[PDB]
């Protein structure tokens, strides 16, 4: 029938039925729940070296069309019918189909709306879709990315956009961006072992170096794009510096914060995910929104496996960093997340705080149930990395599940890539 | 056959094989994860009006005996085997069996060990077992409870202990405590519609008033113990005042914090849970450990559905509480907690901070994997309510599964209790 979920903070309740249309791909069983695995194969869509069998594609193609037309306020039977018929015929002779513009626009938004780990989904209906499905070379890919980057940065007043590259055909002619994000910092392996910059990008930074990129050994060096057109070997392109907007970190109270000399790019763009829609697979679809303080001030800067700066910021504040009991870490993280939120506003760049963020999610979630009796959500990913229960999401029971369209993970390209040269 | 989980913060990895011995009672399926439902039926063991059938009990009885005996440094072949015959004949002639003193102790410490939601499991070895299975009256329960409260408080040097009342027989003579904790403040529904005290307890506070208790309409009024002996109607017993060690809240720097007139008890003791062991169910097993700061500072004080003191302290600090983006709520929560952890240390009462607790769990978790190659863990409860990404458990992948012995949830007595008067 349906499972009920409650909100212990508000007392509000929802009846989720949408979950019945989910895809039986999760790994949890009545014996054990595996909801805390970060990158599960269950949420990953691997590579193929052979087209998707037309037969298997047909059921899915029909399913999407149905959903597409099932979405209209006022039905359009003829078109709906005609399309089901029209698409059945195309897959028969062609062995695959093409999405109309409106369909691609619809698919990218629903896929976003169907993103369990995203808290910004309130915007799910405001997305700029760049149709680059006719692209054919690495250089083009680059120029499209630059166009996307310019539109989204919008001089600081950031906007959500996505550029969809050619869909997967036989799986051997994949168009993919190798970096995890369009804009991200290098990570250098020093001669003494220590890492320089963002330790999370060592593997990728080395690949650029091996491919001819010149290392500068900086703390905040912008990695070049490692593009792959038509399954060819990846080529390097460097995003033009003026296109990459950054923000310098400063605390409104602590005069010394700027001496730490930190900064960060303003545009957060996921570049390596795979868009799945009606049986089609677009391994090339970089998208973006705007930042949420916590992502930078807590994760990027304070994760031990990253810039790990809590130590120093504790020293500067002169807190008793010798004993945890004093909660110096908690105090520091706060000042660090206030710096990011302040700095960004001071430079007039769009950013959001976890409070406002969590708050808009609730309105969104309430609408999702009021519209389709469902909203797939992954608690572990939605609740902010600090002040967790201060935000209303921490008290929201939720169900996680995969739908369609959907944004899947992909296996690192350099792990499965056979080098032609 | 196993599941690899890792810690993205340290890179350490474990292989879990213990989840295979778990009970298939979870509700997660391949089509949807429900790991975030707070008080699920899966984790609850409700009432019944007939005794546990022997055909279903025997297996479980034996399985426990094997498990208990398989926990010895050196096997006790004869004892182990003889014990199985005894339980069988016993279950065969009376339709049930009695555990021994050592088996009971084993069961409780083991149950604690399998509590996925307890972050303080590193202490499972140190537990005091008060045998009250020969109990037979509400006043006798009251006495046992006061005995427990005294041994545990130990004048500030808290000690973990558990009291076990009679095991369940036919299911109509249940020995249980209706409250959720041996110590807990009342919730008064005022006439203006507001709530005085702990709003989390409006229902039990009323049931008390309905049972002759006199309301003092205070802000921290210790509630009486509603005791159900031998399935009879409940009866109130007031825990002797000052047999209730409490802590007054003071902030090391903010001298105005005292003026808030806040305090909390020092003994955290769950009372309304059921202990399942070898097929036997013990509906009355109150036990306690010692508070972890956040329990009081983050949740008890700041949850809007609780004392909700977040704004009032925000105005005291002068923080711009009208702009979420200023992170004023985050400023508050930290100080409130700084306070909580400070007070306890001041009156010399055992308290543990969320950082040190996490640090120890990681230690326990490695031990548990080396040892039993498993560790049922519920991520959603282990990550602290404030400063998540700062603790190691936040980047720790884990598996949540139900083993045996086990501490289950029960249906609030008053909803199912058939009154006599
Ligand atoms: C409107 C601005 C906006 C905000 C704010 C926003 N998102 Fe998301 N978002 C995702 C996906 C997919 C994930 C999950 C990322 C992952 O698993 O690595 C995500 C994750 C996140 C996360 C968690 C990331 C982490 O690593 O902790 C935050 C925070 C977030 N989004 C904020 C697709 C989108 C899309 C795609 C059309 C858009 C537009 C989008 N998101 C727009 C936004
Ligand atoms: C005899 C069993 C037992 C002992 C002893 C015990 N715990 Fe637990 N603990 C539990 C169980 C069961 C739960 C889950 C409670 C629930 O789901 O309501 C729990 C939950 C918790 C929680 C989270 C619950 C919440 O409501 O936020 C914390 C924090 C905790 N324990 C700390 C400790 C500490 C610190 C100690 C002392 C070393 C301790 N525990 C000793 C059984 C125990
Ligand atoms: C323990 C593991 O699941 C972990 O790395 C998590 C949990 N929740 C998260 N939630 C978000 N939004 N982003 C993350 O990277 C993570 N990582
Ligand atoms: C499930 C969610 O909606 C929520 O109520 C949570 C999450 N984590 C928790 N963790 C602990 N330790 N105690 C709780 O009561 C909760 N509640
Ligand atoms: Zn699950």
DSSP string for B125-184: T--EEEE-TT--SHHHHHHHHHHHHHHHHGGGS---EEEE----SSSSS--EESSSBSS-
- Nearest ligand for residue B7 CA: 3
Method: X-ray
- Nearest ligand for residue B35 CA: 5
Q: B229 φ, ψ to 5°?
A: -105, 135
Q: B261 φ, ψ to 5°?
A: 50, 60
Is B129 at the interface with chain A, CB within 8 A? no
Dmax of chain A from CA atoms? 72
Do residues A403 and A21 make contact, with C-beta atoms less than 8 angstroms apart?
yes
Q: Under an 8 A CB cutoff, do A31 and B27 touch?
A: no
Is B32 at the interface with chain A, CB within 8 A? yes
Protein residues whose CB sits closer than 6 Å to any atom of ligand 1: A 108, 112, 115, 117-120, 123, 127, 160, 162, 270, 273, 287, 289-290, 292, 295, 352, 407
CA separation, residue B130 to residues A263, B133, B140, B247, B279 (Å) = 59, 9, 13, 26, 21
Do residues B305 and A8 make contact, with C-beta atoms less than 8 angstroms apart?
yes
CA separation, residue B401 to residues A366, A381, B30, B270, B300 (Å) = 31, 21, 16, 21, 28
Question: Does the annotation list A361 as a binding residue?
Answer: no
Query: Would you tell me how many other CB atoms lie within 10 Å of the CB of residue B11?
Result: 9
CA separation, residue A258 to residues A2, A77, A137, A316 (Å) = 53, 62, 42, 11
Which chain A residues are within 8 Å of B399, Cβ to Cβ?
32-34, 36
Domain ranges of chain A: 16-133+160-170+274-288+358-382, 134-159+174-245+409-413, 246-268+291-356
Alpha-carbon torsion angle A44, A176, A305, B377, nearest 10: -10
Write down the catalytic residue from B45, B121, B168, B184.
B121
- Please give the CATH architecture assigned to the domain spanning A246-268+291-356: Alpha-Beta Complex (3.90)
Residue of A nearest to B384 (CA): A388
Rounded distance between C-alpha atoms, residue B295 and residue B372, angstroms: 29
Is A310 at the interface with chain B, CB within 8 A? yes
Mutation for B interface: A23, A29, A32, A392, most B CBs within 10 A: A32
CATH fourth-level superfamily of B134-159+174-245+409-413: Nitric Oxide Synthase;Heme Domain;Chain A domain 2 (3.90.440.10)
H/E stretch holding A177 reads strand A176-177
Is A62 at the interface with chain B, CB within 8 A? no
Is B25 at the interface with chain A, CB within 8 A? yes
Rounded distance between C-alpha atoms, residue B145 and residue B163, angstroms: 7
- The first and second tokens of residue B344, run together, are 């306890």
The atom of ligand 4 lying closest to the CA of B117 is: 12
Residue B290 beta carbon below 6 angstroms from any ligand 2 atom = yes
- The first and second tokens of residue A343, run together, are 């700095």
Residue B6 beta carbon below 6 angstroms from any ligand 3 atom = no
Do residues A375 and A341 make contact, with C-beta atoms less than 8 angstroms apart?
no
CA of residue A380 to ligand 3 center, whole Å: 6
Rounded distance between C-alpha atoms, residue B60 and residue A309, angstroms: 52
Question: What is B337-384 written as a DSSP string?
Answer: HHHHHHHHHHTT---B-HHHHHHHHHHHHHHHHHHHS--B--HHHHS-
Query: Would you tell me how many other CB atoms lie within 10 Å of the CB of residue B87?
Result: 22
Buried b (16+ CB within 10 A) or exposed e, A380-417: bebbbbbbbbbbbbbbbbbbbbbbbbbbbbbbebeeeb
Which chain A residues are within 8 Å of B310, Cβ to Cβ?
390
Rounded distance between C-alpha atoms, residue A251 and residue A335, angstroms: 8
Q: Under an 8 A CB cutoff, do B23 and A31 touch?
A: yes
Alpha-carbon torsion angle B77, B278, A32, B385, nearest 10: -110
Q: After which residues is chain A broken (C to N over 2.5 A)?
A: none
CA of residue B270 to ligand 2 center, whole Å: 8
Number of A:B CB contacts under 8 A? 209
CA of residue A288 to ligand 1 center, whole Å: 7
Question: Does the annotation list B295 as a binding residue?
Answer: yes
B235 bridge partner residues: B227
- The first and second tokens of residue B409, run together, are 């949830």
The atom of ligand 1 lying closest to the CA of A407 is: 12
- The first and second tokens of residue A277, run together, are 């829609």
H/E stretch holding A151 reads helix A138-153
Q: Specify the resolution in Å.
A: 2.5
Which candidate from B310, B341, B401 shows the least CB-CB separation from A32?
A: B401
Residue A38 beta carbon below 6 angstroms from any ligand 3 atom = yes
Rounded distance between C-alpha atoms, residue A144 and residue A413, angstroms: 21
Residue A208 among the catalytic residues: no
DSSP label at residue A365: H
A49 bridge partner residues: none
Residue B238 among the catalytic residues: no
Do residues B227 and B173 make contact, with C-beta atoms less than 8 angstroms apart?
no
* Min distance B387 CA to chain A CA atoms (Å): 4
Rounded distance between C-alpha atoms, residue B91 and residue B59, angstroms: 11
Rounded distance between C-alpha atoms, residue B373 and residue B370, angstroms: 6
The CATH classification number of A16-133+160-170+274-288+358-382 equals 3.90.340.10
Q: Under an 8 A CB cutoff, do B310 and A390 touch?
A: yes
The label of the residue with tokens 């950031």 reads: A158
Rounded distance between C-alpha atoms, residue A183 and residue A176, angstroms: 15
Q: Under an 8 A CB cutoff, do A400 and B353 touch?
A: no
First and final C-alpha spacing in chain B: 57
Residue B146 among the catalytic residues: no
Residue B29 among the catalytic residues: no
Query: Would you tell me how many other CB atoms lie within 10 Å of the CB of residue B155?
Result: 10
CA separation, residue A100 to residues A65, A83, A165, A366 (Å) = 11, 10, 14, 31
DSSP label at residue A79: H
Write down the catalytic residue from A113, A290, A328, A368.
A290
Write down the catalytic residue from B112, B124, B178, B290.
B290
Q: Which residues have CB under 8 Å from A55's CB, separation 6+?
A: none
Q: How far is CA A85 from the centre of its chain?
A: 35
Q: Which residues have CB under 8 Å from B370's CB, separation 6+?
A: none
Question: What is B23-87 written as a DSSP string?
Answer: -TT---BTTBB-TT-SS-STTB----SSPPPHHHHHHHHHHHHHHHHTTSSS--HHHHHHHHHHH
Which chain A residues are within 8 Å of B327, Cβ to Cβ?
334, 337-338, 341, 353, 355
**Atom 11, ligand 3: residue with shortest CA distance:** A381
Mutation for B interface: A291, A387, A396, most B CBs within 10 A: A387
Query: Would you tell me how many other CB atoms lie within 10 Å of the CB of residue A252?
Result: 14
* Min distance B33 CA to chain A CA atoms (Å): 5
Rounded distance between C-alpha atoms, residue B335 and residue B315, angstroms: 13
* Min distance A104 CA to chain B CA atoms (Å): 26
Counting ligand 4 atoms within 8 A of each CB, the residue from A5, A382, A384, A395 with the most, and so the one to mutate, is A395
Counting ligand 4 atoms within 8 A of each CB, the residue from B385, B386, B388 with the most, and so the one to mutate, is B385
């Amino acid at each position: 029938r349906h499972v009920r979920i409650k909100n212990w903070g508000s007392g509000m309740t929802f009846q989720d039925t949408l979950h019945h249309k989910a895809k039986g791909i999760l790994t949890c069983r009545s014996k054990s729940c595996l909801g805390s695995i970060m990158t599960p194969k269950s949420l990953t869509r691997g590579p193929r070296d052979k087209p998707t069998p037309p037969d298997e594609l047909l059921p899915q193609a029909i399913e999407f069309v149905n959903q597409y037309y099932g979405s209209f306020k006022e039905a359009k039977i003829e078109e709906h019918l005609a399309r089901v018929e029209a698409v059945t015929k195309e897959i028969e002779t062609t062995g695959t189909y093409q999405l109309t513009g409106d369909e691609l626009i619809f698919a990218t938004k629903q896929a976003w709306r169907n993103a369990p780990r995203c808290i910004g989904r309130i915007q799910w209906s405001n997305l700029q879709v760049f149709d680059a499905r006719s692209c054919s070379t690495a250089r083009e890919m680059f120029e499209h990315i630059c166009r996307h980057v310019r539109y989204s940065t919008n001089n600081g007043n950031i906007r959500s956009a996505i550029t969809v590259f050619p869909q997967r055909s036989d799986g051997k002619h994949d168009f993919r961006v190798w970096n995890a994000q369009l804009i991200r910092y290098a990570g250098y392996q020093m001669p003494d072992g220590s890492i320089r910059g963002d330790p999370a990008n060592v593997e990728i930074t080395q690949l650029c170096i091996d491919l001819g990129w010149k290392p500068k050994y900086g703390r905040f060096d912008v990695l070049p794009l490692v593009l792959q057109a038509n399954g060819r070997d990846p080529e390097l392109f460097e995003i033009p510096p003026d296109l990459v907007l950054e923000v310098a970190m400063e605390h409104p109270k602590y005069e010394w914060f700027r001496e730490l000399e930190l900064k960060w790019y303003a545009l957060p763009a996921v570049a390596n995910m795979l868009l799945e829609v009606g049986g089609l697979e677009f391994p090339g679809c970089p998208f973006n929104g705007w930042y949420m303080g916590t992502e930078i001030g807590v994760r990027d800067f304070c994760d031990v496996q990253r810039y790990n700066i809590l130590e120093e910021v504790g020293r500067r504040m002169g807190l008793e960093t010798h004993k945890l009991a004093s909660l110096w870490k908690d105090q520091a993280v706060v000042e660090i997340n206030i710096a990011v939120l302040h700095s960004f506003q001071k430079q007039n760049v769009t950013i959001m705080d976890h409070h406002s963020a969590a708050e808009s999610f609730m309105k969104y979630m309430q609408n999702e149930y009021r519209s389709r009796g469902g909203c797939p959500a992954d608690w572990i990913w939605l609740v902010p990395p600090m002040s967790g229960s201060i935000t209303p999401v921490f008290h929201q029971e939720m169900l996680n599940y995969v739908l369609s369209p959907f944004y899947y993970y992909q296996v690192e390209a350099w792990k499965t890539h056979v080098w032609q040269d």
